[PDB]
Structure formats: structure tokens, C-alpha cells
């Protein structure tokens, strides 16, 4: 879980999911779990 | 481009999608005011080498040719445009751009094809027959080959303006 203030796509499996006022990204690849919070 | 009112105060122009334009030739010099979108759709095609039908509010179709545009800074949307009512025989000198067709024999070898001058202004364009483009052979070029305006075919009835020995296109070396 890498906390980056700049979350952007890195492949073709990354899906941005807006949660409870937070930026998260789902992906089959567990190394692509970026999150601003 | 259906032209409507044409005052002098830009009060009812900035708010709405209108752009301030003018037109002249040698007689009348009445200022106009054309639509933003209409122009942004038409100038994209005919550019500066093609006239368009300009009907003023009332029934006045006056043929003209775009001369100088004064686009705005900080923005891509123009703010002023100058028009020239084409005469019939010898109007004004028109600027004709230079395109390129066919793959060169120097681009393959490793070098790159570089147009030194995009736009090229000529003399006496000739009404009703204005060159909207310009096709210049590029394949005959290799590495370090310079092609001037003495090498560009004339669109028949058109004479050059710039110096005969000016480099229009040149194939630069790699790196």
C-alpha cells in the first residue's frame, strides 16, 4: 500500500474507485494498490 | 457566415459568441462583426487561400479573402480578423503554405525531412484561381539536399515573390 499524492494509471487493469471521500485504485496486481490516504 | 449588426461598441459582443472583424479594399471600409463558431469552423479550411460568401444583414453578398488575424494571447480563441475584398484581376499578394507528399529517400537512410519555411508568399495569385495548397516533390532529396523556390512547380499563372535561392525544404542529418 504505497501512499502517493499523485495516483495515476500504470497499466490496463487499474480501476479508480471513489469511496468515502478518499481516492483508491483496485487492480488484479497487488503492487498497483496506490492510495492518496 | 451570416453577418448581422456591425456597431463600434463591443458591448454586445464580448458576452455572446461574436468576434470583431473588418473588411476593405479601396472604396468602402465599413466595419463588420462575425460569429465566433462560424469563423472557427470556416477559417480552419479555406485559411488564407480561399474566399467565402459574406452576406450582410439585408441582402449584400460581398466576396472577401482573409488577410491578417490578430488572435488573443493566453487563449486559443481569436479576437480580431482582417478581410480583403478580392477585386477581379490583380488583388493583393496571397501567402500559400508548403505541404509534402511521398516518402523521401533521405528519411529512410537516417536523415529527417525538414521544411525550412512553412508559409511561402508569392506574387499575383490570380482571382478565382487561388492556390489553397502547394505540392513539392521531396523524394528526389537525399542527405544535405537543398530545395529552393526555383524548384517548386508553379500553379500556372503565378510568379514567385521571395528570392530564387531561398531554402524551402532541407533534409537534416540524424542526431
Amino acid at each position: 500500500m504505497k501512499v502517493r499524492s499523485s495516483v495515476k494509471k500504470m497499466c490496463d487493469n487499474c480501476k479508480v474507485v471513489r469511496r468515502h471521500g478518499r481516492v483508491l485504485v483496485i487492480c488484479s496486481n497487488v503492487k498497483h494498490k496506490q492510495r492518496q490516504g | 457566415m451570416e453577418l448581422t449588426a456591425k456597431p463600434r461598441t463591443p458591448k454586445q459582443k464580448l458576452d455572446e459568441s461574436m468576434i470583431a472583424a473588418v473588411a476593405y479594399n479601396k472604396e468602402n471600409n465599413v466595419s463588420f462583426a462575425l460569429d465566433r463558431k462560424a469563423f472557427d469552423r470556416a477559417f480552419r479550411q479555406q485559411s488564407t487561400t480561399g474566399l467565402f460568401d459574406i452576406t450582410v444583414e439585408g441582402g449584400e453578398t460581398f466576396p472577401a479573402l482573409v488577410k491578417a488575424v490578430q488572435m488573443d494571447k493566453r487563449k486559443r480563441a481569436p479576437i480580431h480578423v482582417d478581410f480583403y475584398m478580392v477585386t477581379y484581376g490583380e488583388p493583393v499578394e496571397v501567402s500559400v503554405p508548403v505541404h509534402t507528399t511521398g516518402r523521401s529517400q533521405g528519411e529512410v537512410q537516417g536523415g529527417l525531412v525538414d521544411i525550412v519555411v512553412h508559409n511561402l508568399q508569392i506574387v499575383a495569385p490570380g482571382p478565382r484561381r487561388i492556390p489553397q495548397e502547394l505540392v513539392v516533390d521531396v523524394t528526389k532529396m537525399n542527405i544535405g539536399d537543398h530545395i529552393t523556390a526555383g524548384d517548386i512547380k508553379l500553379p500556372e499563372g503565378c510568379t514567385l515573390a521571395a528570392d530564387p535561392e531561398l531554402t524551402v525544404v532541407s533534409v537534416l542529418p540524424p542526431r
Binding site: - | V69, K73, D114
Partner: protein, 136 residues
Amino acid sequence: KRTKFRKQFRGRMTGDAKGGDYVAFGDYGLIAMEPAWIKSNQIEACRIVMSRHFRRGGKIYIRIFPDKPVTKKPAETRMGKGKGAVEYWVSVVKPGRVMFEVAGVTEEQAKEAFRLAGHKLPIQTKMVKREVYDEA
């Protein structure tokens, strides 16, 4: 990068853009939306990254040479006059000013070079296309 022989010192002031077209010497370009100062080392960085991205070409045009000497604080104090004769040079940049232009590469191959350089500039910028034909 740096000038070859000038006077020495200078002043400071920003007014609206003046002499920056849209399409000059090439197909694609990059413009400022914000008025600032461009250190020479910033330029160098840009130029260089652009080089990395474009193995062969050398069709990178940079017409924003730095002609502004800026002074600097020796150590401390304040007793004494004009300080820091040589620190760095700058290239005033006003919105509308064309800093960088390139040609030959595709569409995708310009967004990249530009996008990168852009992460080295102290102000936002944008990429444009051909459509303007003022003076030639």
C-alpha cells in the same frame, strides 16, 4: 545557457507577454500560462530530458536564452553594496511566450517530451497546434 559578455547587474519587473507566436520553427510547441523567471539550469534540464526522449533528431528548438543576471547573499550581514555578481541567469517568461518547439515526431511522441519538461517548470504550461499565420 549563459551570455558571453554583458554589463553585470540588473533590476526586476513583469509586464504582459510580447513576442511569442504559436507555431515557429517546427510543428509542435509549448507555452506558458503563468508569468515567471526561468533559470538557465531549468532550461538545460528541459533540453536534456527532451534529448533523452528523442534518441535521434536534434530538431529541438529552444528560443528562450537567459539574459538576466541575479545577485545573491554572500554569507550574512548587510553592510556593503551590490552583492553576488555571479549567481545565475534568468529568462523572463510571460504567458503566451513560446519556450520550446519540436517537429518530426508524432502526436504521442510530443505529449511525452513536453509532459516531462513540464515537470521541471515553475509554472503551468500547455501544448498547441498549427492554425495561426500572422507574419511570415
